[model samples]
Target: IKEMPQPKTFGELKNLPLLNTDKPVQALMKIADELGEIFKFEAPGRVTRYLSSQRLIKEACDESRFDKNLSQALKFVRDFCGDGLATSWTHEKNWKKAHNILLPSFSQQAMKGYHAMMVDIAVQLVQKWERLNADEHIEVPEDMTRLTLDTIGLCGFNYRFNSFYRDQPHPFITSMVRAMDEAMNKLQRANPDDPAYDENKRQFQEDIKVMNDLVDKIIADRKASGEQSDDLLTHMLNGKDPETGEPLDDENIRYQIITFLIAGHEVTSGLLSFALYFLVKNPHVLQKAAEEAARVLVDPVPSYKQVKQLKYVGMVLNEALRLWPTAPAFSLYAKEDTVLGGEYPLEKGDELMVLIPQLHRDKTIWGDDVEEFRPERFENPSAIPQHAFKPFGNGQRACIGQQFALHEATLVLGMMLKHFDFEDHTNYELDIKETLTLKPEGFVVKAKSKKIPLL
Candidate 1:
């Protein structure tokens, strides 16, 4: 085996391959490979820095108490990406208060109410599949995308896109996707003097209008209605700020809603889509998963409580996530000048992007079989180390809707298994589409309805 290059100075590091990607997901593993696991990389027009470790990353994530100092890192993301105006809601100014108020919204009580909404959406996908005569494979991501968008809209916001019924994407979903494309395009080719900038900016503004207008209408409709309930929308509308003793303004509420809409559905769709892709590839795993689903699903729909009993189903998801987590990497910075892993010293402004793919399959933790598709690794909980398996991420800043996403994925997969079987036409590894999230490109899968549905 050829050895990796030896350690080098900052100038010497320049002699090695420069890390650059118009596609952020592309060439990431290559960067990790050509260079040693931990090494500083300087690309033209970007900062040079080190990126992940097992114990190292976990410790950084665990510093939720010191997150006030994490404001700059959060600001860093908003500055470059500007995903939303998280200024008052989930941002530094009001994170603690806002976070606390938002906690009840995702509680077990809240999840109990949202369960049927998820099951109903799953039923929609199943109904759609039953119509397709399966002469050829169909793109699973397309339906997975619709299912998740429908779930989040109806379940979280008490709004309805009914994405499944439409032949084209709903206007809001269409605009949201366009806005992301335009933003990413601009982030790369944003030349002030470039004449093309004018037309792109104009189209980008148009997309933003459609995206924001739908959200504005939803909030306005909610406020106008005298009706109120335990839905996430009601919780946010009534939840008070401890710091200011004020209710969140419509602008702040709009930001949070948009945040949830994008963040909520995108990752879950990726999870379900990839999980299904892997299940089809591993036929035995698929059969075992279907068997479990048939046995556990006594009712037509599994309750939120019953979903917990889907042990092997959850294992399949965990294993798939191990290979293809949607949020592959994230950047965070030091609260103070501190050393990470007792070796990598970091200043307050120093930021690092922990590559989730590498850490989840660490050689020390997973050994030689890290490359294998083995859901059985998760058969027992204690075998995995702390912070070893985190597809939804970790710490206070971790995905708040983690439980929501996992439950949604489990229920949908189980329900689909209850009445349909999945198969794939292609043998090659998935050509994953890394847009707003990681999705399987050409997510083509064949399906056949079972003659007798599981009870």
Candidate 2:
């Protein structure tokens, strides 16, 4: 069997330009650009193969040979979120429990139930922008962050962050962001080796405490009030797994809450930030998307039906995800010794990182304009190959909130387009800021309110 391509030695790996960049995934993308698809890289005792094509990625993703396993930064995320959906091993019992219990929460009817709360938070964003000084440059990522965090807070647990009412985000968010930052940092810097390691550990625990305590309080309060709602918290507290007849324990419930808050908000916010970046940069696309929004959103507040009608806006979001794919990479490992693509060998326990950004821009699939910002590529999704455009993920473990995220983004993007004219007055080039997800760095836009009516 042929061996996969890789840097020659430790010295070669150390000096590789990919390791120098702060943008980790993009750094890897650059490496993929040179090494070609299905290449290996080693750091210390660990070795990982990066896959960037539909064929090889599909092979790696086959459940019979490989299983979803957390490694590196995701393992660190487990320290923050425990065996929650995004961080759990496939064989874990709780993963089954949580996945089964939560699956129906993202169904079409459930999305309809969540639509009003989404609109409520979205209206808050509109009001904030409307109040801004006429030429004020709105920080795209920050506001998107606020909007998403607040939406998840309310929709998931019947709690409100009141993010738009103040300049700083809620303390829960501050601590969560800092903790995630530390998780990523631990993956890079040697743990307990740096001078600041002790203090960092201290604060990390404290930040986790902040999340756990607040989540615990939210749980206690919900139970105390004896309030029954269709929100995620109520569903977890009340819903049972059809197979096992098990309800999530309170401790597991806490982890799931933290998981939802982090997972639900971060990626969606990044999506909004990037979609707006792409839309504002490509005015023609923005105009077409806005026109579609105007056609659908005849009413002030977006209805569930209107959200369904925003097809072009959906295409815009799809193209944006294709270009950026905020959650840029996912890790999986082999369960048995196998030959991948009928050539390269993968032994049991060997990890493979599926690079989504590179796969989405495969020159063989997308042709010459791979780097261009065009939403029309998604116009006919069936024309794309299976497993080729997995911005959410692959296999049964793909993102459960796919529809929820698309609905929220489509609604907000439509609203923003319908109510205001956005301009990138600063002529900003895209710079990505990565946490667990990706967001455009320093992206700000000026808006002129269209004087559109809203309640």
Candidate 3:
């Protein structure tokens, strides 16, 4: 006899067989139910182990004081999510300090620099696309990823990696991607009860060490040279904590810098790639986006101010994120025994993987055409639940860099659409590779330029 498929209720989930599937929503629900069972009985070893990694002896020893402020909640989420490095540092109080100190650095002036860098990169990318018209096919996603990395280096740190111009991949870039990849792989395969789990935990630590050492060297060099720049790094090093009035230490500053570097480049590139993929396939959307861009940016090269005028460009990006969220789910380990939605009883150690993709596509919340690429669907606020559309997440732990991401994405997309008339290649299909984030499998595309005259 064949085994039956698992039932979708909380009770039936108890007997469901453990199996991994490509459907992110069903997989998450199953994992949540399994975890609920294990942690419901007692304080599970995984949560204890996480606490032990922070060197905490009891719940009272945790770093947060529970004042119920935005800072405290954000700190809790950062610590709980393990900073995407998936290490004990996520639970450290300093992470909160770092987050607080870094928040202000993403200012309007800083975003201007970010926007400038993106426009410069887009110009170069468009040139490359034009050059490809004369020669072989150029991979757009890989180029975009490199462009984004270069953007972060310049605007985020005032450091220049010149990753886009490099013939070989940068060591630090390779390591950062590898570290995230390794951590996600481990998380998927890890059995917390196994003796080898501790050993597996060390991989992220090793990755962090490499990142920390590199950042430390950069900081020291910058300090020694006494070169003052108006980048995120300089702001963190010089700015005081509003509450405490103390400048951030090198370690704390590095955490925010590295976190932003990794998060900013990876996610933005993924979204842009997806956006381009969709636009190339659907010329109508591309035409609409370009029409908006052209209306806003009459100049040969768009300035930072023009990015805001491209409202349709913003909608295009929102649709892209909804369709291809880099981090599809945000997993939270329940801190105490609690009931979610008055139905699912979450225990202290259970993981709650909030399925954003499922929520984005839900029939009840997003309507029946949820799967369709319709940016106008979002024109009315009442059409969907506010919580149903969380590309950057929601509640207190939403991405602080969301504005920055939006600004950067809009700038890049607006410029690209303004310059290029992309034609979709029918032979190719979008093959998604899921790791800590979702990325294109081959990272290949065939697109041609519009030959539009520059102003």
Candidate 4:
């Protein structure tokens, strides 16, 4: 009834160490190289089936045959962002309401409203870079985080994090960071008897309270002021789900706000960091992308209309996301007992992890230069096979902020490209730092401004 590759067992334990490691994707890929694409890692109480091939991934993505599984990682995220769209289970009612009401905020019309604020934060990053001496290196991930965090803060709510002015992140960020880090650490150390458990748990709750207090204040302030604006906070406060005619309650609103701050900033910041890494490594691509940015961004801040004209810059973003998808791997469970590829049988409740990095590295689909950074591959996105590239995820569970993120990243990358010349003084290899998302670790670059003297 079933045919699948299971890792060799050492007595009672089978691939337990692999599941316990911080770099599960790398370890699983190594085994995938030895075994074929579809394999199972059977731990004591858990059975995680990992899929790499496009054929298997495509079949798994069929909403008719399978549904999104809230993997152990995202379940931890629920503590941070309750039933917000990202962590909410498939059948949850709140997912639909939040999803419906919040959908319009990321639309093309809404993005235009956000352009000035997006440009505001991007300039903060540019000016921050302007202050650095020529020999000094800018930490790509850190600054990108600041830029994105501030952007989301300004755009999602009418609040300002002022992330650029402060040497340290805002208290909200500190709390969110510690909370997510602890959650991910829990994933690695599955044992509950660890000595640090109580402290970690206490810290986690404290962090959650910090976030909850901040979000509640933001909501209360808006309520008290009686200011009605088009921001996401206002939308949730006033709007109702079209399906059920129900408004998002304060608790769900709090979850959605935190979810936006976490999901909105974390993934985009990683994409920007990774894109900058690729551009510095491949100077020719940098030259071409900068040229496009120069042509499009005639003004200091790119207008919404002009941002659309940054087609090449958008392609570069796509390629970057393709290579290093920030929100890596999503979970899926079979809808019923079924056979995938007319071979491997999947029973109901069997969870599978679609390894995106491996799926992207497929030689046949992406050709021999699959390992290389080539933005041209995305020039004609229609040419790529269906389900072959899903950096955002699949089906109803896919990223709702897809266009919002792309627009923000394109604007930031375009401005940076047009205003500065980027160089990598240190030859850095790609070392991924994983939290809930993935980013380049120990990655730094030198930026020489092409513009005139700054204010």
Candidate 5:
């Protein structure tokens, strides 16, 4: 029964007894994870797939001949988005044009330009932390999201969300958050028969409209703005495609703005929330991280260069990402009919969702302590090989915002550690909500102001 022929279609895959579960995709991956370093599972309306070792994931990615396109299932997701955003930001359809133009915006030089602005946002959040009453419960996920969104608003578009200071979430933010969830849920969920679509469909449409309208306005404002800031939008709009030598048009640009708001926002918030959870769960580790920050993070407001020196803080975040990568699977497809992992024969459009969490925990790569929340694994010289540790996918197709997220997180976490201590009173287990990306559902922590903030 276990060796039964793999189903080819997501429709067929959904009906399979082997793939049956409350949550087919994540649950199937969990099953394969427990089974071994590599295994195969199919999703509804998708491809014959493989969940495999990191080594194999890297190989498939590096081969470069495999179309590197997203699966048909994802196309259903992108096409279903109802916005041209599908082609503009996600999947491979129109990504190269956008990717080439956006590359310079994420360069190391661009990261440094963003560093000071990111710290200012972190300082604003720090000010709010100082105002918290004793033992007041902070929803870590929500608050961190506010900070990240706030960071992206100013840095990405040169707008301010004022998420922490607002009495209520900014109208755009309310809709942005809602749209992010709705768009992703619609992409993955088999809810055609469920009543959820009945209630949510209207709300989701409105949510999508709000974000789209807001993005359109921003694009218009930027085009006419007599002045421009050093934000990502400036670089993106001004930058042209080296390949085609084309201008970044408003239609595609509009989608990129929303993509940063929708896809990029959630991932950053999740990374911060999960990293904080690990820090609070292990007090000694938290202390060590803080102490490391205190030692080298000499500036009240740390800079990119300063955060770069904080090795332990980097180690802690790396470990957190390893244990719970925000994007756990970098699902890509075979261009032409080819073999995957030297075993599974993947048809031209066959999907391979590399379950990254499973690979991160592979015993052969990380040793017996694979299950442990050990930050020091990164500090060791003999740590896992380069391509194996891919929290942010690999190569040209990897996350464009990788450096931006890391730099912002490093500076913000460094500032927070230096000024405060946090405890997880929520006792939340690793409750994960699987979307296109994995989101940490709970971020409840009790924080105490340890010293005057860098502000």
Candidate 6:
């Protein structure tokens, strides 16, 4: 009998050979057996039940409401947390009016403006890299996250968060992070058996209220003054919903703004951090991506049209998402009893959580060499089964920000690679923290400039 290797931490447990994709249930069970006492919770059992429920809900929702605009459904998810900038507006009478009013203003043209903002920020980043010297060791992810935040502020709202210059922590940023952290922690602590067993749930609710209140004030001030910018908030505020045909009210406007800000910034930053980490580790892959970037972009900065031409960079980003999806697990509670995967039975009200990380690395789905970093695997996506690769998730409830995320990631990654060569400076072990998002523990990297001659 082969001896089972000892896992010193939760992250290590995930990397074990026995935790194959095909048998996630068994893998999770092993983890539960090892750490359940310490965590004082049946984590695996809850997760299994959650996944089963999610699959069932997805199936039912697909059959009954096939045509529901996912953006609206996502608004419902936000609504579950109360009157946030994104959720409350969906409930407003002017919701449709607001959506309609905002649509044309925030069209593809606006995205171009957003892209320009990101490029400006990216250039500034390159300047910083040059100043510090390519060989200078720094925490690339931290800097990049701040840069992305700054970009979002400039492009999305036309307001600077001063993320770069704030020597002390900004209260808003710190509070948002804390709120997200607390929300995830509360969800993890929820009782599998009792629907209302989440102890920290109140804290989560309070945090959302605080964040939303702050955003609401901002929207109000902007509206009263007749000030407008190309940011998503401005567009949404001035537009109306297509379906409802009503102008967005303050609460609803806040919901969309916060959603755009949080979803847009958080996921993209995480992806960039992971992308840099992987590129540094795999020179061949990096070179291929950079080559594609150079061929398509030609200029120091790439345009949206040029971004689309860099297929290899897109493929690499897809590969990065597959390997290290920002949200490793996604959950939903079953509205009714249902069957999933043709076998897993779920009861009504059961919490379903899809273990995306395990599924991405599943041998049955991705083949035997699943652990290896290979971007070519995505070159022919149709060859794989429908539900096999769900980094952005599957079915009606899948992410609406997927297009935005892909575009942003490709553009930022392309610009970064064109200007610099990233290297993993820290030999620190990759620690997986299950926050609202899956974040790398101590994610730090060093970079050197390519010193490519300017165009």
How much does each candidate deviate from the true structure in C-alpha RMSD? 4.1, 1.8, 7.7, 1.8, 3.7, 7.6
Clashing pairs in 3: 79-90
- For candidate 2, what's the RMSD? 1.8
The model with the greater lDDT, 1 or 6, is 1
Least accurate 10 contiguous residues by lDDT in model 1: 64-73
Using alpha carbons, what is the TM-score of model 5?
Answer: 0.87
List the pairs of residues colliding in candidate 5: 10-44, 10-45, 11-45, 67-335, 140-443
Q: Best lDDT goes to which candidate?
A: 2
**Can you write out model 2's per-residue Cα lDDT over 303-396, one digit (the tens) per residue?**
9999999999999999999999988999999999999998998789989999999998888888889989988888897898778898988788
Computed on alpha carbons, the lDDT of every model, listed in order, comes to 0.70, 0.88, 0.61, 0.86, 0.71, 0.61
Q: List where candidate 5 sits over 4 angstroms from the true fold.
A: 1-26, 43-45, 71-94, 187-203, 380-383, 453-455
Candidate 3, RMSD to the unseen true structure: 7.7
Per-residue lDDT of candidate 1, residues 61-121 (tens digit) = 7564223122222443232223333323235555565566777777667778889888888
Ranking by TM-score: 2, 4, 1, 5, 3, 6
lDDT winner between 1 and 2, please give it. Answer: 2
Q: For residues 322-354, what per-residue lDDT tens digits would candidate 6 score against the true structure?
A: 887885555445556766546545566544445
Clashing pairs in 1: none
lDDT of 4 by residue, 109-160 (tens): 8999998899899888888988898599898998898889888888998888
TM-score of 1: 0.88
Worst 10 residues of 6 by lDDT: 36-45
What are the models' TM-scores? Answer: 0.88, 0.96, 0.79, 0.96, 0.87, 0.76
Q: Which portions of model 2 miss their true places by more than 4 Å?
A: 8-21, 191-196
Count the clashes in each prediction.
0, 0, 1, 0, 5, 35
lDDT by residue for model 5 (1-455), tens: 13323333345446344533334446755666556655555556544455557666766676464534554434444532332333333454457777777777888788888887788788888888888887687877777888888888888888988787666877876876675555555544555658767777788678767767778888888888756787878876788778788866776677677767654567887888888888888888998998998898776677678888989988888998988888766566666777655665666766566777777877767888887788888887555675668888766767788888888888888888988877777687877776555666865777789766454
